[PDB]
């Protein structure tokens, strides 16, 4: 939709990453921000994040590349809906709130119980989480 205010907001967000001002985000600058927030990423994680945005293979991220990344939306609903199917055992379209909490807090990124609570509490009535509702909320 070619938003205008978003550019002013994005340029500010790009400035917090580009300490140089050379118009370029590098993995070192990406790790500097993540480490400032208490995160401990690896070089594989940092370059995976930059490879995902580095559209021209520069190895770095300029502002227009950042802007394209931020302008993306969410298609991608089929991939997310397919991700839940890995944990839908009965195939009915439901994951147990006990199962979801167990899989989400123990695997991958590891959500917190209160984070999973917001998932289950958006879900419906008895502990049967409808993941199709979740795919819809995020899209």
């Amino acid at each position: 939709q070619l938003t205008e205010e978003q550019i002013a907001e994005f340029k500010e967000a790009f400035s917090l990453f580009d300490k140089d001002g050379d118009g370029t985000i590098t993995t070192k600058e990406l790790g500097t921000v993540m480490r400032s927030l208490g995160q401990n990423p690896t070089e594989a994680e940092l370059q995976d994040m930059i490879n995902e945005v580095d559209a021209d293979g520069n190895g770095t991220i300029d502002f227009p590349e950042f802007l394209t990344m931020m302008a993306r939306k969410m298609d991608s609903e089929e991939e997310i809906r397919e991700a839940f199917r890995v944990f839908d055992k009965d195939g009915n379209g439901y994951i147990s709130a006990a199962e979801l909490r167990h899989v989400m807090t123990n695997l991958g990124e590891k959500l917190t119980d209160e984070e999973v609570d917001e998932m289950i509490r958006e879900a419906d009535g008895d502990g049967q989480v409808n993941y199709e509702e979740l795919v819809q909320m995020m899209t």
Binding site: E9, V53, E115, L134
Partner: protein, 65 residues
């Protein structure tokens, strides 16, 4: 043994964390232990980082398949 169980979990986690961050009062903001107070400059860079991690978890899920 089924390399999608971790990849599918991370795609859901990163997609939800990216979606829950638009709510400034979500419980997803309470995970940044090392920050005494979450100022506005933290939330700007956190939104960006969570968007990148979703894109990585998006690609890693398609790669395992």
């Amino acid at each position: 043994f089924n390399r999608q169980i971790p990849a599918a979990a991370s795609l859901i986690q990163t997609a939800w964390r990216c979606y829950a961050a638009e709510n400034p009062d979500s419980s997803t903001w309470k995970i940044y232990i090392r920050i005494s107070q979450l100022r506005e400059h933290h939330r700007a860079t956190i939104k960006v980082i969570r968007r990148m991690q979703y894109f990585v978890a998006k690609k890693k899920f398609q790669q395992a398949r």
